[model samples]
Target: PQITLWQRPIVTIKIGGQLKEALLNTGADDTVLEEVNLPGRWKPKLIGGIGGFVKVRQYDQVPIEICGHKVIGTVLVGPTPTNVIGRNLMTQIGCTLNF
Candidate 1:
């Protein structure tokens, strides 16, 4: 599907068995979430944003449902202002844009 970029492109996605709004950001390389409680281990990582950096738990093989399409990948959990659905995961679902 064709997507438009201007302000944050908000989309509803199910992650960790919960539904939440995540920004469809092509500029972002990885997905970031505000809260997620899942079973398993995660690696520690730092993520830089518009201003500074924040520490997050890098959960691998996390499953998310975007518009009923199941996607499995890494999702970073931390204190972000908003949830993000980055290009790394969006690419799997074939997202297109117009100029």
Candidate 2:
């Protein structure tokens, strides 16, 4: 996805066979998603960000598609205000924040 700066890099993603929008957070480490369901076992985890630490369910080896590009990685299911695709998944999709 060839994108320009000064604008939100929101992209269409497919998770659990459902289409949704997510932010391409290059600065973050792990992908954070709002309350979502997955048919598998997950372990409780704590994630700290700009605001503070928040408890989440860590789903490993989750398959997700970003902009039609398929990649499997870790997804943190939690109560985030917005769905974010962090570097964990971003690197798989080859996203770089170059100015």
Candidate 3:
């Protein structure tokens, strides 16, 4: 899909039976959710971004529906400015930035 940079690339996504909106951040290497509790085992890790680094819980093989496109991969649970759909899932969704 062709997108304009006038506004943030935000989209609705489904995760753990809950519907939420997230930013499609091509610059982010990993997906981060502000306050979503995911099931299964997770490990604690640190992820750095635009601002700084923050500690987060890393959950692997988590299934998510991004704009109805289903994909499973690693999702980080922690504090962020906003929920973000990063490159990890974006790659699976076949998203690319094109002018």
State in Å the error of residue 26, model 3: 1.0
Residue-by-residue lDDT tens digits, candidate 1, 33-58:
98778678899899895587788999
TM-score of each: 0.86, 0.90, 0.90
lDDT for each of the candidates? 0.84, 0.88, 0.90
Per-residue lDDT of model 2, residues 1-64, tens digit only = 6877679889999997688899988888999998578779899999885587788999999999
Candidate 2 wrongly placed segments (more than 4 Å): 49-52
User: Which of 1 and 3 is ahead in TM-score?
Assistant: 3
Residue pairs of candidate 1 with colliding backbone atoms: none
lDDT of 1: 0.84
- Residue 29 shift from truth in candidate 1, angstroms: 0.8
How many pairs of residues in model 1 come into backbone collision?
0
lDDT of 2 at 47: 88
